[PDB]
Amino acid sequence: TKEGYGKHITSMHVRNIFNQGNQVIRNIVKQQRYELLDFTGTEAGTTNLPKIIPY
Amino acid sequence: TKEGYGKHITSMHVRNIFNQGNQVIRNIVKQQRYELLDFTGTEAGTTNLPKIIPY
Amino acid sequence: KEEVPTREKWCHTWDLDVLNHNYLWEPNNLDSQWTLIPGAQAVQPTATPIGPTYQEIVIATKAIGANESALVTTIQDRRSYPRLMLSQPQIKDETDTMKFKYQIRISTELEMEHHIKPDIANPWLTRQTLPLPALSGDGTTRYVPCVPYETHVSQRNWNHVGEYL
Amino acid sequence: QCIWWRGLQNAANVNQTINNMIALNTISYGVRFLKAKLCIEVYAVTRKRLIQTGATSYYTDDFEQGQNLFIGWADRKAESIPITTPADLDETKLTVANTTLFDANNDNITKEEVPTREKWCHTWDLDVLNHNYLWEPNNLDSQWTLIPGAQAVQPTATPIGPTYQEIVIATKAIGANESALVTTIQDRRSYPRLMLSQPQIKDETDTMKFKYQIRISTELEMEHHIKPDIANPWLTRQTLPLPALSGDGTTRYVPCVPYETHVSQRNWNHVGEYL
Amino acid sequence: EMEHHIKPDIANPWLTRQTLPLPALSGDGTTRYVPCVPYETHVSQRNWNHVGEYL
Amino acid sequence: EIVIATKAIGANESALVTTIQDRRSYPRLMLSQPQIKDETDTMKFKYQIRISTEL
DNA sequence: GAATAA
DNA sequence: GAATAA
DNA sequence: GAATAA
DNA sequence: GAATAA
DNA sequence: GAATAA
DNA sequence: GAATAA
């Protein structure tokens, strides 16, 4: 007979404890920025022109 | 009067969107290892002696 | 237009998950500009083709080194991304326009699920990875497309049509 | 991953089920592999007991009913079967060097171990295929030919092609004057690598040597959709060619990718930052 | 019956995204054979029933 | 149990990190064989095992 | 236990 | 999912 | 399926 | 009417 | 949607 | 208000 004593012991079933490559981490990129919009200038991006948000 | 139209717009309350340094990631170090315990040898760790688990 | 006065905020949320059927975008450090937010938008320049990842039905080939390939191939929902701008009122003064300059704080935060690597190498795992809709080309300047709207069309037959059939 | 379900590793392994299959592949415009169920049966687990006095060894084989055949799955690691000849694929003589179900370091194998008088049965559903399509009618004589799957990883040397990726875009000839842009979507099947190995037990000299008496039992459900009652060369529209490797390469590595990770379309919950 | 989806109120050459060209034959051929395939066979995603072999 | 330590934080600052924590006796753990006297000393056992340690 | 404690 | 989808 | 989907 | 009788 | 899908 | 009145 194959028998033995132990604690937190069990007949051995399938164990592969590596995930099958499924895991998800979640960060939020957080980029608060104080900015200025200057239309008072003649230079490049400072003009009467609409300033763009390139989402 | 200070008023303007918008969508998903609100009177501006306190916003600092950086966490106050509280965040928790959880990995499990996973280290399955097939090993041998050899007491049949005369060399170093192979002997009659109990082999140790240094948790 | 959406106009914000002082002590009012313009908040707008985009859902950048365009993507169906157990796929992902390649892992990317965003250092690269001319690189676009997830979208199925269909309009690419001839000069800097964005490629299949950019069209709704993606058909692409990822290398996986020399010896292998992955015909990563998905369908995804189409996202028209209009153009967005921050401009002033146009008010003719005695001389041209009045000039406005806004003190603002933009606040831009971006949710991402970074699906981390397997516990064991799978170069063949790129199957469900897609490259971003990055513009590819030698062009120093690149025009990133904004198409305002995706029109709704019907699969429905007619109603209140006078001709009897 | 390959198709040995015809039992190619020896031409001696043909039964009318194969013959029935061939006659159906003749009268059929297209086919689907609906289900594939494999059952291993272990009649014996037999190690070679090596009794060694110095400078001599006595050999005898002895039954171990306390040991069992390990059916390994490589679910953590990207691996390939090299395939060359229909014989090169055999449940027995087929191997890859420096491969062990037991690594001293990271054991990457999910094992299913069968003792004597226990069987390993595993079923694969080979219907990957949606939207009223089929695989071409095929006599499986051709190795380097793969079971239905949307698996996305093909070699550069022997591209499997669109049929192998999830969204199929291919051109079937229909002779010279016509073509069919057979074009479907199908669900992705990661097919890991499967192995039959022994326990690795260091003896005084290297490993103990085990040899298993077993009966593999491999049966494969197929709906052979038979031909129209009238010629339609243009009917290949809903037929696809198999994920067969194409190339001049004598040896071809058939890919096994362990798993298809699950990702969410769901937004977050219990995220502390308020938004 | 045709729903002619009329143009935007503003030019969108980039709107062809959801437009497709017809299945027009392209070629120099003066005579062109337009294909007619009688039927799309129904195949099952269903497993079997009343199969005698037990499995 | 009661931690009193000084973390540097560079030269200009310090932290008298100072906590209480519950006491953990960690015994010694061993993997050994039965001791069975044979005609010559002990029987020699060698175990094929897979340790699996995840943290 | 707007400042991320799953 | 009279034009064969057990 | 204020940005025209009868 | 695990050995295939829709 | 034992192989980590918060 | 099969001959198109949303």
Residue numbers in the entry:
A (entry chain A), B (entry chain A): 47 to 101
C (entry chain A): 212 to 376
D (entry chain A): 102 to 376
E (entry chain A): 322 to 376
F (entry chain A): 267 to 321
What does the paper say about this structure?
We report the discovery of a parvovirus with a bipartite genome, Acheta domesticus segmented densovirus (AdSDV), isolated from house crickets (Acheta domesticus), in which it is pathogenic. Our structural and molecular examinations revealed that the AdSDV packages one genome segment per particle. The AdSDV capsid displayed an overall “smooth” capsid surface with the only protruding area surrounding the fivefold symmetry axis. The AdSDV VP subunit displayed the canonical eight-stranded jelly roll fold, complemented by an N-terminal βA, located on an elongated N-terminal region.
The vpORF1 sequence could be modeled into the FC density map from Thr47 to Leu377, the final C-terminal residue. To accommodate the density column, the peak of the FC DE loop moves tangentially away from the channel, which is occupied by large aromatic and hydrophobic sidechains, such as Tyr159 and Ile152. The AdSDV is the first parvovirus, where the “density column”, occupying the fivefold channel of the FC fraction, harbors a direct connection to the ordered N-terminus, confirming that N-terminal externalization is a conserved mechanism and independent from the presence of a functional PLA2. Each subunit interacts with the C-terminal tail of the fivefold neighbor to their twofold neighboring subunit. Five of these are interlinked and interact directly with the capsid surface via π-stacking interactions. The AdSDV FC structure displayed the highest number of ordered nucleotides thus far, which directly interact with the interior capsid surface. This interior-genome interaction, which involves four subunits along with two separate regions of the ssDNA genome, provides additional stability to the otherwise weak interactions at the twofold axis.
